[PDB]
DNA sequence: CTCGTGCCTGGTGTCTTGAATCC
RNA sequence: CCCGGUGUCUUGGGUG
DNA sequence: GGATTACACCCAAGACACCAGGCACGAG
């Protein structure tokens, strides 16, 4: 249950958007921004 | 200075001036390379040279 | 809520002054006491809360030496040591104290 | 010998259980509260124990025979994860789900509570009943300057200084020893009781200043 | 009023997707159009 | 009164004691918007110096609360929270004062009201658009789908309208393509569709001849005969009632294990509770479940059949309109029953110490005021923990640019379709928009023709007791259903009331 | 073509959790639940709508 | 003088179950 | 005695 | 299962709950 949890850690801190399973979340209830969600999309480094 | 702006500057084929607006005219930064393995690697004191 | 330093069981702390320890009264005489002599005899600090339901077949039981003792809550890990005083009070009746502060 | 009491096949298993984070006493004393209920009915509950260990959070183990029982035990409790995660335990893993398991004089231990929270100090005297002990501290004082504390919004360590609370606000009572504000000083420490279980013993890491200092 | 403020994201969409496909084509020095890896598109811009 | 009681119980051994714990909420109390200063002085608060100080005018809630203690060996007004005024509502100090006061309170009197301040901000609910509740619709599904039509239902209560559970009857087979072209239902909490002859028997009705009398009311076409006959085939096999609830509860596959002698007691819930609900939920009537089960079944043919079109989603007649009223019930609900689990928590806990609780301590009023006032503020509608799925912008800062927008923003609906997907459909004007929503008012951008706004006439049911018109419906010579048959009734017309066959009469035009 | 199929379900005899396999044989209408540890086998009858959970079901209610 | 009881603050923290169509 | 800067994440309505 | 719904600007309104410990106040 322990080395699991690290695994799950390293995972979402580089992507948050694993499907098939529940988001990492902080203390807020929204969604950790991962590495990964910096890069996509409108608002990120690549297209903004 | 958007998507479709750095279109227009490549039709007109003004290559020079858009260099220009997205470094000097904004956030231009100087980093140094090693000529060896080619990482942002290096530490430079520059007043130490 | 307190533990016994002799035999473990977990009581509110009013029950180790009322009622004495229901496993070593006899010895201890907590009922008969005063609150300094039931606080150098059971401990507010204590770890790793045991259901024993059947005493005498729990192998957890025996494990912990509690397998002579009456169904209740126990603590696997008391701290701090009976008084010497007292400790060689039981001696004098004939029982060994086997510290469970680990 | 505690080794004449290691466990046997002929001993009943042990499962572990899952249950909702700071809820492990409360499954253990459920299960107790049915166990006693049902003692002697034609519908006992078949458990002989049930345990949770602070190091293993989230998980209680509940001896029994059959698997059957440790269902029956946690039937209708709002503390369990409904998903059938019941795991086996190996009889070689028994014992070491129920070991039990310093700070001696002149030693440094670091205090866990107050304005001197956080600090390093020297654990100089124990208490008798064991409750309580003696450290050595680096004061943190202000010599009454602004009165008519908090570990946020204390004053900085220093020595304190008898010549200076004299000037500025102290009974002697010894060589070096002075009660100031109710608090004794020896040749510039703090002597202040603390709680045992609000000082950290182990894996204690001297910073910087504390080897510039002692 | 509809359809003017649906549509117009449709051929938004039409002409992003169409800059990218051909950004990198330029005429050289010999006539030719190619796009950066040096592939020939046409022999001589628009046959002419 | 929806959860009326709290109960405990506790069996205790040293002598067995049953000592029930139970609690009994009564009466409810209102008191005028009252602002209590750090002092501990008490005034009543006017809408003007709550805009200047920033506080939140709302009223504090008193419920009347019962100890009772059953024991058997074998008082005082506790306050919920405070609960925020509409603005020249029956409970706002404004209400009374008249013209003469109005101006000594700083309020202009072309001002209606019609919203709340929070926080010193003015904020006004959007009326929330939504699909009616307990009718059918029957829609066709696209061509790379073994299904070609649906008929759907989403259940709910006439107490209180909240929903409960939703429900679907499929048919499959595509054109030529699926062979066997039978028809399988979709229950709540139950895995894979279940064809329909097998809830048929196991609703008690097991009988063949019986089933097709309850669906089809017309014996001399084939068609509407012969699309039933796969189904018939495919369920022929489960012959009684017993077999039929076991198959049931085996599909939900919840704690495996049930067994036959549970595992249909089981099933016999999910047939009685939740599959539609809105019916009854009393025992003993299956009766009426079974007669609409083959109404359902009747009309999916008819689509499938070509002889009536298929529903039109956008009909203004099948929408229905969320206003202040029904959308603080929905959330005022979620929230107490998180204040009564508070409770509950609690009493495990100070029950063990045999302590005399004080009542008042064991009610947290922060649950339901910061649980009301956040929602408000922000338009999150829901709990704070669940932004996500959840739905935004039901409250907005009111707009007061000019006065003719601010009539405008209270009189505004939304429809919560969402700014993905251009469609067909919802943006436009539908026909039946006539007289009900102003047909030039609309955004441009993204919202254009989802937000709409009421015509000048327009009113919206404020809603009614069903109880009264059934009294007059069996007066007038309404028959019972135990009464029917397609045979003897070939020519009758049923009767509706809010969504349920009750009743068929022989002569509809003087009734 | 017969149908192989591990699932969750518990064994009643060796009570081991997750080995119960299930094979069902629908051109003769027979299933049958095998254990992966102890390896009792038990038969019985299915249709063409049963699934894992239908003979499991059926073997509890063999048993009792 | 000494014990019972309420308020402020910091370390810690998770779960009763409840929109559509192109490749 | 030069130099001297302050915010991040979402929601709702507009403009073209 | 995932992939997406043209580009740019402005306005206003909200941000973390639960339990153990000490300290201060009141009563005998
Ligand atoms: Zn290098
Ligand atoms: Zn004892
Ligand atoms: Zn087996």
């Not at chain 6, 101006?103 to 904020?123: H, T």
């Amino acid at each position: 249950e322990v080395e699991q949890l690290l695994q799950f850690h390293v995972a979402t801190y580089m992507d948050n958007d694993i499907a098939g399973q529940p988001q990492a979340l902080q203390k807020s209830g929204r969604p950790v921004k991962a590495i990964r969600a910096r890069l996509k999309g409108k608002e990120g480094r690549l297209r903004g | 200075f958007g998507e479709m702006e750095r279109d227009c500057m490549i039709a007109h084929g003004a290559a020079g001036f858009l260099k220009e607006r997205l470094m000097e005219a904004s956030d231009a930064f100087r980093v140094h390379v090693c000529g060896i393995c080619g990482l942002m690697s290096v530490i430079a004191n520059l007043k130490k040279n | 809520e307190r533990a016994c330093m002799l035999c473990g069981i977990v009581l509110p702390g009013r029950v180790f002054m009322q009622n004495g320890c229901p496993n070593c009264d006899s010895v201890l005489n907590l009922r008969d006491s005063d609150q300094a002599t039931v606080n150098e005899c059971t401990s507010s600090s204590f770890e790793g809360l045991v259901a024993v339901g059947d005493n005498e077949h729990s192998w957890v039981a025996k494990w912990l030496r509690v397998d002579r003792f009456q169904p209740g809550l126990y603590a696997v890990r008391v701290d701090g040591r009976l008084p010497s005083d007292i400790v060689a009070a039981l001696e004098q009746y004939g029982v060994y104290y086997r510290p469970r502060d680990g | 010998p505690q080794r004449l009491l290691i466990p046997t096949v002929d001993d009943p298993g042990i499962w572990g259980v899952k249950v909702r984070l700071g809820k492990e006493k409360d499954v253990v004393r459920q299960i107790l509260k049915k166990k006693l209920a049902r003692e002697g009915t034609k519908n006992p509950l078949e458990i002989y124990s049930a345990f949770q260990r602070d190091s293993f959070k989230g998980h209680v183990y509940i001896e029994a025979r059959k698997a059957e029982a440790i269902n029956d035990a946690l039937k209708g409790n709002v503390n369990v994860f409904s998903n059938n995660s019941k795991f086996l335990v190996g009889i070689v893993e028994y014992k070491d789900l129920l070991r039990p398991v310093k700070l001696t004089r002149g030693s440094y231990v670091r205090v866990k509570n107050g304005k001197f929270k956080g600090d390093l100090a020297q654990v100089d005297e124990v208490l008798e009943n064991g409750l309580e002990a003696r450290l050595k501290l680096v004061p943190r004082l202000d010599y009454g300057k602004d009165l008519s504390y908090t570990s946020k919004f204390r004053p900085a360590q220093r020595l304190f200084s008898e010549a200076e609370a004299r000037v500025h606000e102290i009974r002697r009572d010894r060589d070096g020893f002075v009660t100031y504000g109710g608090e004794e000083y020896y040749e510039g420490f703090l002597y202040k009781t603390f709680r045992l279980q609000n000082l950290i013993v182990n894996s204690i890491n001297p910073t910087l200043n504390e080897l510039s200092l002692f | 009023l509809i359809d003017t403020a649906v549509k117009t994201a449709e051929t938004g969409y039409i002409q992003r997707r169409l800059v990218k496909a051909l950004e990198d084509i330029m005429v050289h020095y010999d006539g030719t159009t190619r796009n950066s890896l040096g592939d020939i598109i046409q022999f001589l811009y628009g046959e002419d | 009164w929806e959860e009326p009681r709290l109960i405990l119980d506790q069996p205790a051994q040293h002598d067995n004691i049953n000592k029930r714990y139970e609690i009994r909420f009564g009466k409810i109390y209102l008191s005028r918007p009252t602002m209590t200063e750090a002092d501990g002085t008490t005034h009543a608060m006017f809408p003007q110096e709550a805009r200047l100080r920033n506080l939140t005018y709302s009223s504090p809630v008193y419920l009347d609360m019962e100890k009772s203690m059953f024991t058997s060996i074998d008082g005082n007004k506790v306050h919920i929270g405070k609960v925020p005024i509409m603005l020249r509502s029956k409970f706002c100090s404004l209400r009374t004062l008249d013209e003469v006061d109005l101006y000594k309170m700083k309020e202009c009197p072309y001002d209606m009201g019609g919203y709340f301040v929070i926080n010193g901000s003015e904020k006004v609910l959007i009326a929330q658009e939504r699909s009616a509740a307990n009718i059918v619709q029957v829609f066709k599904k696209a061509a790379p789908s073994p299904i070609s039509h649906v008929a759907e239902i989403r259940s709910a209560l006439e107490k209180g309208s909240r929903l409960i559970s939703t429900m679907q009857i499929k048919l499959y087979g595509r054109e030529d393509k699926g062979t066997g072209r039978t028809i399988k239902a979709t229950l709540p909490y139950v895995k894979q569709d279940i064809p329909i002859v097998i809830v048929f028997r196991a609703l008690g009705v097991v009988p063949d001849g019986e089933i097709l009398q309850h669906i089809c009311y017309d014996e001399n076409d084939w068609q509407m005969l012969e699309m039933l006959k796969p189904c018939i085939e495919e369920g022929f096999v489960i012959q009684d009632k017993e077999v039929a609830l076991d198959f049931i509860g085996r599909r939900g596959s919840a704690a495996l294990g049930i067994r036959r002698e549970k595992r249909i007691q089981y099933a016999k819930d999910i047939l009685q509770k939740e599959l539609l609900p809105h019916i009854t939920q009393e025992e003993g009537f299956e009766t009426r479940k079974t007669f609409f089960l083959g109404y359902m079944v009747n009309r999916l043919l008819l689509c499938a059949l070509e002889r009536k079109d298929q529903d039109d989603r956008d009909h203004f007649g099948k929408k229905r309109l969320d206003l202040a009223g029904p959308l603080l019930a929905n959330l005022f609900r979620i929230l107490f029953r998180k204040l009564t689990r508070e409770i509950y928590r609690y009493m495990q806990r100070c029950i063990e110490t045999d302590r005399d609780f004080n009542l008042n301590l064991a009610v947290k009023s922060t649950t339901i005021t910061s649980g009301l006032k956040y929602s408000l503020a922000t338009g999150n509608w829901g709990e704070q923990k669940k932004a996500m799925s959840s739905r935004a912008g039901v409250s907005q800062v009111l707009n007061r640019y000019t006065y003719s927008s601010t009539l405008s923003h209270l009189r505004r609906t939304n429809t919560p379709i969402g700014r993905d997907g251009k469609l067909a459909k919802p943006r436009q004007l539908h026909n039946t928009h006539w007289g009900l929503v102003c047909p030039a008012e609309t955004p441009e951008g993204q919202a254009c023709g989802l937000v709409k706004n009421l015509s000048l006439l327009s009113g919206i049911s404020i809603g009614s007791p069903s109880e009264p018109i059934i009294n007059f419906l069996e007066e007038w010579g309404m028959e019972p259903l135990e009464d029917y048959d397609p045979a003897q009734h070939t020519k009758s017309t049923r009767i509706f009331v809010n969504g349920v066959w009750t009743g068929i009469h022989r002569d509809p035009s003087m009734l | 073509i017969k149908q192989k199929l591990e699932t969750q379900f518990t064994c009643l005899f060796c009570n081991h959790d997750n080995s119960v396999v299930c094979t069902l044989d629908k051109k003769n209408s027979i299933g049958l639940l095998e254990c992966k540890k102890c390896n009792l086998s038990f038969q019985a009858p299915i249709n063409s709508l049963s699934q894992p959970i239908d003979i499991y079901s059926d073997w509890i209610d063999a048993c009792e």
